[PDB]
């Protein structure tokens, strides 16, 4: 009944829905109700879209950031096919007309009733775009594959849609009573408190008295703060730190206002979190491990039933050479000049605002309500924790609504991590993510995985769980599609555990042949087959190809899973790598950033022929990596095996020999330039991102000639110099030991790549600052965000970074 769905949702999201109920938290219950209605209502909107609108929902166009080609076309009811010559400049429509006409005149005697499906993928060609704007077509013009498409009539598209349906009156100091605490180790105990707005201190911190390493220590000590109850900003949070003195122990935070803006009065038991001293960015909800978490007991002094003032009441209440406090005062003084003449400097203005004074806040808020929308780039900055105010938060979201689905997809990883900054469950960001998610199935797909992958983390398990639940209410059908993916990943985990055990006790070929027998069990064949890929919902993983499955004899023994589809031919032979035991968030970020470089470069004419292959954490130290087909490690090739076509007289010739064995005759020259472009992209990418520990085992090359990096795990230093491998130069110089014309064009590719990136440098800084929310160990400080200082030399001009890049480039040809 409705129980079945609840059951399925509990299984999918990784948490029983009953566990939400058992909290009897009215904030939790209001979220679920309000968001369910919101999400069910979008679902209602979806069920009645035009068939082309539904195409846009479920299969958003995959577009690239004249000269004719072969295309293969068939219809849905018949396996009869027609091969056409068309131009890369032709619209899908023209192709559909040539398809309809040749059908008409073979069955004996309208294109607007059709769309073109890519064979074996959840991808479609439609809209008024030349064919060469479609990613699948571009991937065929480079692979030399022939595009195979299927004429799908509007009637069976609608069949798909339908089957997928379902008070400033308070003078006194604000003060706390610190009653007592309880859990321990090991000396003397102190409780440091603190009033914060974001990570701006609302006032001076106050420590408690030194008390003995008693367990259940006691204080009753009233703590009064240097700020009045009427001057607490809406988003004020009180932060505690409990430590030992002759060593940190725990921290815990909370909002002084509830989620209904009612200022908090009464007793609070604060279930604390373990430590590294005050941690304002930390979550405002208590440690769920109540059986063993230290708890701090406090009392919140009553003051009368007061609510934070409504917005109406709030509202009724040389400058250039900046783009020091005397400086800070000029900006606030000249704040009207900001709005009307420097609207995008809003961030800087908000940072000089006095958040501990309600009149200053009301003034700023009044300006904020008249403030014109900002560019996406400005808005990305405003989402950071250093802009905690809810109205600012909303303004930021409002400025983000013009995000295209392509950009939103690029930034989605960061928007999700920002959720960990929120103070309340119901928030504009959550509502925005959900809306976008319900309107674009690809967003929804990855929204889900970003949330599901962290459910093992107790500080976000609740929020993320609720969000996935609401989204499931918004698509009962996608939930089942998603369950299917989790069932496959559950089986891959079981299978991987067996391989870990078996390979320690027998040989690889024995483990492999029993990996195969495990896979051939019916529950495994069923679970592992006919699923959308979590790496890319548009990629369909049909028949699992057991005989080509294997595993790496390395480390975590990751699995190699191959698929084939008898309806895709070309685009159906694909593989995924399942890895359990490594943290993959790092790799995902890095590949995201490289993909964004690829976009920035490409949307300026420069195609460095990158390979941004998929990488998706799906669970605790668990995820998928997309297999890049027809590729090999530098290591395997430089191994210079006997017998092979690439066997060389000199080690430096192995790579170039390998390429020529893969690209005979004329074909070699394109492989060389591909190697060359891709080389320059990754050299610049790895230099800017600070990816070290680069070697022949983590660099690969495609038979096309394309070089790409894998297994990143580091970046930002956690300081790296530009890398130039002599064996690469040798390929670049087409083998000749002097070839300045080929070598200097390569030096050209690097510098332009570098300068393009240097222009959108702020974008990178904004995204990485947001990423700090993720708690990756390699991105924890200002010093990390600093490293992106030099790489991009954003302090300098023109380029007066001019010549940073010489030295690093000219140093790099040490090797
Ligand atoms: C290193 C390589 N990594 C990738 N290989 C491609 N093709 N695409 C990727 N995205 C990545 C990654 N990451 C790789 N990864 C594996 C992962 C799991 C299981 C196996 Cl059995 C392998 C494996 O054999 N190789 C390998 C392949 C060609 C030569 C030497 C070793």
Say if ligand 1 is within 6 A of residue 698 CB. no
Ligand 1 atom, smallest distance to 560 CA: 19
| 3 state DSSP class of 448 | helix
Cα separation, 62 vs 536, whole angstroms? 12
588 to each of 329, 403, 410, 594, how far by Cα in Å?
42, 22, 12, 10
Cα of 628 to ligand 1 centre, how many Å? 8
Say if ligand 1 is within 6 A of residue 723 CB. no
Say if ligand 1 is within 6 A of residue 632 CB. yes
Residue 534 CA, distance from chain mean position: 14
The residue assigned the tokens 């398809």 is: 99
Cα of 562 to ligand 1 centre, how many Å? 12
Return the structure tokens found at 484.
Answer: 């299917």
Q: Which helix (H) or strand (E) holds 80?
A: none
Secondary structure in 3-state letters for 234-276: CCCEEEEEEEEECCEEEEEEEECECCCCEECCEEEEEECEECC
φ, ψ for residue 524, nearest 5 deg: -80, -40
Residue in 599, 593, 606, 611 with CA at minimum distance from that of residue 751: 606
Return the structure tokens found at 602.
Answer: 């490409």
Residues near 799 by beta carbon (within 8 Å), at least 6 away in sequence: 755, 758, 793, 805
The resolution in Å comes to 2.4
* Count of C-beta atoms within a 10 Å radius of residue 539: 22
DSSP conformational letter for 535: T
Q: C-alpha dihedral over 352, 356, 358, 364, to 10 degrees?
A: 10
CA neighbours within 13 Å on the CB side: how many for 515? Answer: 31
- Specify whether the CB–CB gap between 797 and 755 falls below 8 A: no
Query: What is the Cα Rg of the chain in Å?
Result: 29
Classify domain 48-166 by CATH number.
Answer: 3.10.20.90
Class in CATH terms, 476-627: alpha beta
Beta-ladder partners of 699: 709
Break the chain into its structural domains and give their ranges. Answer: 1-47+310-475, 48-166, 170-309, 476-627, 630-815
Mutate to test the pocket of ligand 1, among 691, 710, 711 (most ligand atoms within 8 A of CB): 710
Cα separation, 569 vs 799, whole angstroms? 49
Cα separation, 551 vs 176, whole angstroms? 59
- Specify whether the CB–CB gap between 767 and 384 falls below 8 A: no
Cα separation, 235 vs 342, whole angstroms? 26
Cα separation, 434 vs 39, whole angstroms? 7
579 to each of 493, 559, 627, how far by Cα in Å?
9, 6, 12
Cα of 577 to ligand 1 centre, how many Å? 8
Residues near 526 by beta carbon (within 8 Å), at least 6 away in sequence: none
> Ligand 1: which residue has its CA nearest to atom 16?
552
Cα of 625 to ligand 1 centre, how many Å? 9
- Specify whether the CB–CB gap between 660 and 669 falls below 8 A: no
455 to each of 15, 16, 372, 465, 472, how far by Cα in Å?
8, 12, 38, 7, 16
Cα of 446 to ligand 1 centre, how many Å? 24
| 3 state DSSP class of 240 | strand
Cα separation, 327 vs 330, whole angstroms? 5
Return the structure tokens found at 475.
Answer: 């698509």
Residues composing the chain: 815
| Axis crossing angle, helix 740-759 with helix 667-689, rounded to the nearest 10 | 40
Beta-ladder partners of 222: 177
Say if ligand 1 is within 6 A of residue 551 CB. yes
- Specify whether the CB–CB gap between 234 and 261 falls below 8 A: yes
- Specify whether the CB–CB gap between 11 and 483 falls below 8 A: yes
Say if ligand 1 is within 6 A of residue 560 CB. yes
Residues near 349 by beta carbon (within 8 Å), at least 6 away in sequence: 331, 332, 335, 338, 364, 367
- Specify whether the CB–CB gap between 636 and 648 falls below 8 A: no
Cα separation, 44 vs 161, whole angstroms? 12
The residue assigned the tokens 């990178």 is: 764
Cα separation, 164 vs 444, whole angstroms? 15
Q: Would you say the CATH fold of 48-166 matches that of 1-47+310-475?
A: no
- Specify whether the CB–CB gap between 496 and 580 falls below 8 A: yes
Beta-ladder partners of 173: 228
Q: Which helix (H) or strand (E) holds 64?
A: none
**Domain 170-309, what fold?**
Immunoglobulin-like (2.60.40)
CATH architecture of 630-815: Orthogonal Bundle (1.10)
**Domain 1-47+310-475, what fold?**
1.25.40
> Ligand 1: which residue has its CA nearest to atom 2?
633
Cα of 721 to ligand 1 centre, how many Å? 27
Beta-ladder partners of 616: 624
Cα of 711 to ligand 1 centre, how many Å? 10
């Amino acid at each position: 009944v409705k129980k079945l769905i609840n059951s399925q949702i509990s299984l999918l999201i990784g948490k029983g829905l009953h566990e939400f109920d058992s909290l009897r938290d009215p904030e939790v219950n209001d979220f679920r109700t309000k968001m369910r209605q919101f999400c069910e209502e979008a679902a209602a909107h979806r069920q009645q879209l035009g068939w082309v609108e539904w195409l846009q929902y479920s299969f958003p166009l995959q577009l690239e950031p004249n000269r004719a080609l072969l295309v293969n076309v068939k219809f849905e009811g018949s396996e009869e096919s027609f091969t056409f010559q068309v131009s890369t400049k032709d619209m899908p429509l023209a192709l559909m007309a040539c398809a309809l006409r040749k059908k008409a005149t073979v069955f004996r005697q309208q294109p607007e009733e059709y769309a073109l499906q890519v064979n074996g993928r959840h991808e479609y060609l439609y809209g008024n775009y030349p064919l060469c704007h479609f990613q699948y077509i571009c991937s065929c013009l480079h692979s030399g594959l022939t595009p195979h498409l299927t004429m799908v009539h509007s009637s069976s598209i609608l069949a798909m849609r339908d089957e997928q349906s379902n008070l400033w009156s308070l003078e006194q100091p604000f003060s706390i009573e610190l009653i007592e605490g309880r859990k321990v180790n090991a000396m003397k105990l102190v409780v440091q408190a603190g009033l914060f707005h974001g990570n701006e201190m609302l006032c001076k911190t106050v420590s408690s008295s030194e008390v003995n390493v008693c367990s259940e220590p006691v204080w009753k000590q009233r703590l009064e703060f240097d700020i009045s109850v009427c001057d607490l900003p809406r988003m004020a949070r009180l932060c505690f730190a409990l430590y030992a003195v002759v060593c940190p122990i725990a921290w815990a935070n909370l909002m002084l206002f509830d989620y209904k803006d009612q200022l908090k009065t009464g007793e609070r038991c604060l279930y604390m979190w373990p430590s590294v001293l005050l941690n304002p960015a930390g979550t405002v909800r208590g440690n769920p491990n109540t059986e063993s978490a230290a708890a701090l007991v406090i009392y919140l002094p009553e003051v009368a039933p007061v609510y934070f003032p409504a917005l109406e009441k709030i509202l009724e209440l040389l400058r250039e050479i900046l783009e020091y406090e005397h400086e800070k005062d000029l900006v606030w003084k000249m704040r009207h000049e900001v709005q009307e003449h420097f609207p995008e400097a809003l961030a800087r203005l908000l940072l000089v605002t006095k958040w501990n004074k309600h009149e200053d806040v009301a003034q700023m808020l009044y300006l904020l309500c008249s403030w014109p929308e900002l560019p996406v780039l400005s808005a990305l900055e405003l989402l950071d924790f250093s802009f905690p105010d809810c109205y600012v938060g909303s303004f930021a979201i409002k400025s983000l609504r013009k995000l295209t689905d392509d950009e939103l997809f690029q930034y989605l990883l960061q928007l999700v991590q920002v959720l960990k900054y929120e103070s309340y469950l119901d928030c504009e960001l959550t509502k925005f993510l959900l809306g976008r998610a319900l309107a674009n199935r690809k967003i929804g797909h990855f929204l889900f995985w970003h949330l599901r992958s962290e459910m093992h983390v107790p500080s976000v398990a609740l929020r993320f769980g609720l969000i996935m639940e609401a989204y499931c209410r918004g698509s009962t059908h996608h939930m089942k599609v998603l369950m299917k993916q989790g069932e496959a990943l559950s089986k891959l985990k079981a299978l991987n555990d067996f391989v870990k055990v078996s390979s320690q006790k027998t040989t690889k070929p024995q483990t492999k042949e029993m990996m195969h027998m495990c896979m051939r069990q019916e529950t495994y064949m069923e679970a592992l087959s006919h699923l959308q890929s979590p790496l890319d919902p548009s990629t369909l993983l049909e028949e699992v190809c057991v005989e080509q499955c294997t595993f790496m004899d390395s480390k975590m023994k990751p699995l190699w899973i191959m698929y084939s589809s008898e309806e895709a031919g070309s685009a159906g032979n694909v593989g995924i790598i399942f890895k359990n035991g490594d943290d993959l968030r790092q790799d995902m970020l890095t590949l995201q950033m490289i993909q964004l470089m690829d976009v920035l470069w490409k949307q300026e004419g420069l195609d460095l022929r990158m390979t941004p292959y998929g990488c998706l954490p799906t669970g605790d130290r668990t995820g998928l990596i997309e297999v890049v087909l027809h590729s090999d490690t530098i290591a395997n090739i430089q191994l210079n095996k006997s017998n092979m076509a690439a066997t060389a007289a000199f080690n430096k010739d192995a790579l170039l020999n390998w390429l020529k064995s893969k690209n005979p005759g004329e074909a070699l020259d394109r492989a060389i330039e591909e190697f060359t472009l891709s080389c320059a992209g990754y050299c610049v990418a790895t230099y800017v991102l600070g990816i070290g520990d680069r070697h022949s085992d983590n660099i690969m090359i495609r038979e096309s000639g394309q070089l790409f990096h894998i297994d990143f795990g580091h970046f930002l230093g956690n300081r790296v110099p530009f890398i130039l491998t002599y064996d690469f130069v040798h390929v670049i110089q087409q083998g000749k030991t002097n070839n300045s014309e080929k070598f200097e064009r390569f030096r050209g590719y690097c510098e332009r790549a570098y300068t393009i990136l240097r222009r959108h440098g702020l974008l990178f800084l904004h995204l990485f600052a947001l990423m700090r929310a993720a708690g990756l160990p390699e991105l924890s400080c200002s010093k990390d965000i600093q490293y992106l200082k030099d790489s991009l030399a954003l302090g300098k001009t023109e380029e007066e970074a001019l010549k940073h890049f010489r030295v690093k480039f000219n140093e790099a040809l040490r090797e």
